[PDB]
Amino acid sequence: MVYQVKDQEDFTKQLNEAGNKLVVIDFYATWCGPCKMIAPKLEELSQSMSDVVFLKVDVDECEDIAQDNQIASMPTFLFMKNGQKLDSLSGANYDKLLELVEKNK
Numbered sequence: 001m002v003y004q005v006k007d008q009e010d011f012t013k014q015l016n017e018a019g020n021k022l023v024v025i026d027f028y029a030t031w032c033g034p035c036k037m038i039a040p041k042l043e044e045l046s047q048s049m050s051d052v053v054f055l056k057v058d059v060d061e062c063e064d065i066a067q068d069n070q071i072a073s074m075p076t077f078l079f080m081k082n083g084q085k086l087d088s089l090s091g092a093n094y095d096k097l098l099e100l101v102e103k104n105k
C-alpha cells in the first residue's frame with residue numbers, strides 16, 4: 001500500500017524511517033483524472049518493490065507540503081533519498097516513473 005502522508009510531521013516521520021531507501025512521493029489531487037488512472041499501477045508497484053518507500057500527498061489536504069515543494073503539475077512525483085531531492089516527474093507516465101525509480105534507487 002502507498003502510505004498517505006497526513007501532515008508535515010508525518011512526512012518528516014516517513015522520511016526518517018525510510019533510512020537510506022529511495023522515497024517516491026506522489027503529489028496528487030482528487031480532481032486529477034490521470035492520477036486516478038495510474039493509482040492502481042502505483043499500488044502494485046509498492047507491493048512488488050519493498051526496496052522503495054512510496055508515499056502520496058493530497059495537495060488539497062496537505063496544502064503547505066505542496067507549496068513548500070513548489071508543485072505545479074498534477075501529478076508530480078518527487079524522488080528523495082538521504083534527505084536530498086534527487087529528481088522530479090510531472091504527469092502520470094508510469095513507464096517514465098519506473099525508469100526514474102531505477103535511475104534513483
Ligand SMILES: [Zn+2]
Nearest residue numbers: 059060061063
Ligand atoms: Zn484543502
